[PDB]
Design a protein around this ligand. Structure first.
Ligand code: HEM
Length: 396
């Protein structure tokens, strides 16, 4: 009896998650032909199970897996997608991630802190100067793209087309004939830009990540041109909308919980714990899927090879067997093992950088806009897999 399109579910899905959890540990959903998993223990376990993957073609033809191959007109998208580590399974995943993690390191993250803090400060100053604005458009949206641009080493000169590129490519996962068109178009355009920067970095080495990707090697193993383009597009696409919606989701929760906002404003040392609790309370990434590569059993229920599982991260983050009073926002929550950055081999390689951007944004807002208030009830985007608002009207 579940309709993820119901406007009440889009407004507040957490009561329905409560019902799902109470009704069982795996539920077949005919409309999407998917098996829904809502408990934290099950989601955690399945993300670490070697019998599940974000791809199946390394093991089975589409046809042997009981599926239909995608249009060859979408080859440029599928090529760019299938060389990024998010949709790779071992041993290809292992190789590209071991290689990428030689260029993209803890030192790389540390080096961005000053630019993250600087940029955050500037953004909030401008909003303060205007005495208010749209937290999404003016503060949340600009920072993530800029940080990845900076890490990749791209001029503010040519940084304009990145958002619209990332937008149209991601449109493919949201699929209209028109969406598909721009998505392949952007996939080509963006990949050519990358292709270019890859060479003027080969004949002209730099200190950026594109240059660290060109250098990265191990056991004489190295990255292909496509693996590098795919990695760069993945880092922008993965590090943008999630970070944006965590900042706006967080501030909306803070405005709706004035006791917690006042606690935060009174003790800025809560910022790290606050970033984590606001993500558990209302994660922007509600849902992730896995193919069943070998038959599994969940709670004595057999899920067959060829099935697709939907992991409800939102449900898992409100599981009362893990969190006490999960429906309550508590920035001082001691016990917060939220799964928002996932688990197993696809565990977010960006999580340290994401946490530095969310902390820098929050600290700037608290220091520079300590009187910030919500002007209007925001409009919720009609989407149950990426949970977000159209914008956030604020005033000092
Ligand atoms: C609020 C911020 C973020 C959240 C909640 C988030 C969450 C996640 C999740 C859940 C996954 C795995 C999905 C799955 O298991 O199916 C993932 C993967 C990934 N994330 Fe993030 N992420 C965030 C920010 C970022 C940032 C800033 C970057 C990069 C700069 C990034 C890069 C990636 C990459 C490259 C992967 C693929 C990892 C792999 O497949 O091995 N993410 N992220």
């Amino acid at each position: 009896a579940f309709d993820p399109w119901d406007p009440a579910f889009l407004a507040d899905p957490y009561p329905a998650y409560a019902d799902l959890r109470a009704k069982g540990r795996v539920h077949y959903y005919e409309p999407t032909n998917q098996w829904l998993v809502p408990h934290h223990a099950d989601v955690s376990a399945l993300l670490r199970d070697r019998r599940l993957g974000r791809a199946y073609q390394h093991r089975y033809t589409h046809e042997d897996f009981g599926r239909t191959a995608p249009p060859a007109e979408h080859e440029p998208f599928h090529t760019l997608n299938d060389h990024g580590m998010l949709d790779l399974e071992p041993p290809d995943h292992t190789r590209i991630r071991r290689l990428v993690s030689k260029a993209f390191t803890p030192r790389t993250v540390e080096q961005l802190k000053p630019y993250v803090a600087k940029l955050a400060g500037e953004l909030v100053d401008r909003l303060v100067a205007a005495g208010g604005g749209d937290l999404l458009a003016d503060v949340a949206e600009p920072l993530p793209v800029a940080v990845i641009a900076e890490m990749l080493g791209i001029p503010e000169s040519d940084r304009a087309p990145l958002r619209p590129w990332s937008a149209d490519i991601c449109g493919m996962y949201e699929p209209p004939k028109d969406v598909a068109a721009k998505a392949v178009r952007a996939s080509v355009e963006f990949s050519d830009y990358l292709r270019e920067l890859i060479a003027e970095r080969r004949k002209e080495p730099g200190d950026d990540l594109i240059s660290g990707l060109i250098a990265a090697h191990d056991e004489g193993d190295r990255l292909t041109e496509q693996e590098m383009i795919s990695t760069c597009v993945l880092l922008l696409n993965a590090g943008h909308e999630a970070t944006v919606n965590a900042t706006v989701n967080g501030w909306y929760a803070l405005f709706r919980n004035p006791d917690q906002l006042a606690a935060l404003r009174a003790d800025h040392s809560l910022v790290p714990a606050a970033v984590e609790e606001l993500m558990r309370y209302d994660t922007p990434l509600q849902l992730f899927e896995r193919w069943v590569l070998d038959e599994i059993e969940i709670d004595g229920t057999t899920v067959p090879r060829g099935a697709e599982i939907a992991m409800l991260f939102g449900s898992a983050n409100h599981d009362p067997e893990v969190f006490r009073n999960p429906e309550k926002l508590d920035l001082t929550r001691e016990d917060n093992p939220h799964i928002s950055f996932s688990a197993g081999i696809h565990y977010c390689i960006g999580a340290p950088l994401a946490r530095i951007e969310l902390a820098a944004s929050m600290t700037a807002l608290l220091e520079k806009a300590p009187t910030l208030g919500l002007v209007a009830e925001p409009k919720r985007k009609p989407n149950f897999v990426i949970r977000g608002l159209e914008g956030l009207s604020v005033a000092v």
